[PDB]
Structure 1
Amino acid sequence: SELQYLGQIQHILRCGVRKDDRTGTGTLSVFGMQARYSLRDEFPLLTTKRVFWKGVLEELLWFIKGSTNAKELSSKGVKIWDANGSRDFLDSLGFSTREEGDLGPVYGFQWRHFGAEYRDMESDYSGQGVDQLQRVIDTIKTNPDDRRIIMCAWNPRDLPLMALPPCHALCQFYVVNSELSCQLYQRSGDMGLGVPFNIASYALLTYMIAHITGLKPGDFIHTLGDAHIYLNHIEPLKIQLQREPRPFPKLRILRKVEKIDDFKAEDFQIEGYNPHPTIKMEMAV
Structure 2
Amino acid sequence: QKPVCLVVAMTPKRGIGINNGLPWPHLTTDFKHFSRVTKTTPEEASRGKRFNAVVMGRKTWESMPRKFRPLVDRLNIVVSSSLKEEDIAAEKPQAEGQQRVRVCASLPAALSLLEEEYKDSVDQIFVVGGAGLYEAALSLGVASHLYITRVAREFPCDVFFPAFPGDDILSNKSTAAQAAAPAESVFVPFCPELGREKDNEATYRPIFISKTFSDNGVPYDFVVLEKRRKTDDGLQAPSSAAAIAPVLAWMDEEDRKKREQKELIRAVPHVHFRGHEEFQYLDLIADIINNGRTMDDRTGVGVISKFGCTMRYSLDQAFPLLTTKRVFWKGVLEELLWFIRGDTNANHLSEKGVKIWDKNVTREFLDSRNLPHREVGDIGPGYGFQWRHFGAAYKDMHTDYTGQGVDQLKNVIQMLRTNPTDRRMLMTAWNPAALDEMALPPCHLLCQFYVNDQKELSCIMYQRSCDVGLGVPFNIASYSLLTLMVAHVCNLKPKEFIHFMGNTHVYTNHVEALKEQLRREPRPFPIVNILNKERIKEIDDFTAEDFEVVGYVPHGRIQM
Q: TM-score per shorter chain, which class? A: over 0.9
Q: In structure 2, what is the Cα distance between the partners aligned to 1:10 and 1:200?
A: 21
Give the secondary-structure state (helix, strand or coil) at the position aligned to 1:83: helix
Partner of 2:311: 35
Match of 1:273 in 2: 552
2:513 aligned with 1:236? yes
Q: How many matched pairs? A: 281
**How big is each residue's C-alpha offset from its partner over 1:25-48, in whole Å with a ceiling of 9 and x where there is no partner?**
100000000111111111000000
Match of 1:259 among 497, 516, 538: 538
For the 8 Å contact 1:27–1:230, the answer to whether it is kept is yes
Q: Partner amino acid for 2:288?
A: I
Unpaired runs of at least 5, structure 2: 1-276
Q: 2:369 aligns with which of 93, 96, 110?
A: 93
Q: What corresponds to 2:82 in structure 1? A: none
Distance 1:72 1:279, change over 3 A: farther
Q: Specify the code of the residue in structure 2 equivalent to 1:194.
A: G
TM-fit CA distance, 1:95? 1.1
Go from structure 1 to structure 2 and tell me whether the alpha carbon gap of 1:192 and 1:135 turns closer, same or farther (over 3 Å shift): same
- The offset of 1:7, in angstroms, is 1.0
SS at match of 1:134: helix
Following TM superposition, by how much is the alpha carbon of 1:278 offset from its aligned partner in structure 2, in angstroms? 3.3
Distance 1:109 1:235 in 2: 38
Equivalent residue, structure 1, for 2:295: 19
Whichever residue aligns with residue 540 of structure 2, its letter is D
Alignment of 1:145-160 (within 5 A): 145-160=421-436
Which 4+ stretches in 1 moved above 2 angstroms?
278-281
Partner in structure 2 of residue 81 of structure 1: 357
1:19/1:29 contact within 8 Å kept: yes
- For residues 559 and 292 of structure 2, what CA distance do their matches in structure 1 show? 22
* Aligned residue among 443, 467, 475 for 1:190: 467
Q: Are 1:206 and 2:493 counterparts?
A: no
- 1:167-208 CA distances to partner (integer Å, 9 max, x unpaired)? 101000010121000001000011111110000000000000
Q: Write the distance in 1 (CA, Å) between the matches of 2:296 and 2:548.
A: 40
Q: Report % sequence identity.
A: 65
Query: Are 1:172 and 2:448 matched, yes or no?
Result: yes
CA contact (8 A) 1:47 1:248 kept: yes
Amino acid aligned to 2:459: C
- Distance, in Å, in 2 between the alignment partners of 1:228 and 1:55 is 22
Q: After superposition, give the CA deviation of every residue in 1:53-92 in whole Å (9 maximum; x if it has no partner).
A: 0100000001001111110111111000000111111111
Report which of the two structures shows the higher radius of gyration computed on alpha carbons.
Answer: 2
CA distance in 1, matches of 2:438, 2:281: 29
Matching residue's letter, 1:270? V
Determine the C-alpha separation between the residues in 1 that align with 2:322 and 2:502.
21
1:247 aligns with 2:524: yes
What letter is aligned with 2:457? Answer: L
Give the distance between the partners of 1:119 and 1:235, measured in 2 at CA.
44
**Structure 1 pair 280–223 and aligned structure 2 pair: CA distance change class (3 A):** farther
Could you tell me which amino acid in structure 1 is paired with residue 354 of structure 2?
A: V
Contact 1:51 1:278 in 2 (8 A): no
Counterpart for residue 60 of structure 1: 336
**271-280 or 130-139, which moves further after superposition?**
271-280
CA distance in 2, matches of 1:254, 1:98: 38
Q: TM-score, normalised by structure 1?
A: 0.97
Q: TM-score, normalised by structure 2?
A: 0.50
**SS of the counterpart of 1:174?**
strand
- Alignment partner of 2:358: what SS? coil
What secondary structure sits across from 1:151 in the alignment? strand
Paired letter, 2:488: H
Structure 1 position 162 matched with structure 2 position 441: no
Q: Distance in 1 between matches of 2:554 and 2:387?
A: 32
What displacement does 1:279 show? 4.0
Counterpart Cα distance in 2 of 1:181 and 1:280 = 37
Secondary structure of 1:98's counterpart equals coil
CA distance in 2, matches of 1:279, 1:82: 24
Letter in 1 for 2:555: H
Q: Which runs of 5+ in 1 are unaligned?
A: none
- Equivalent residue for 2:405, pick from 129, 145, 168: 129
Matched-pair contact (CA < 8 Å) for 1:50–1:279: no
Tell me, in whole angstroms, the C-alpha distance in 2 between the residues paired with 1:19 and 1:152: 29
- Paired with 1:276 and 1:253, the residues of 2 have a C-alpha distance of 25
Q: Cα distance, 1:280 vs. partner?
A: 9.2
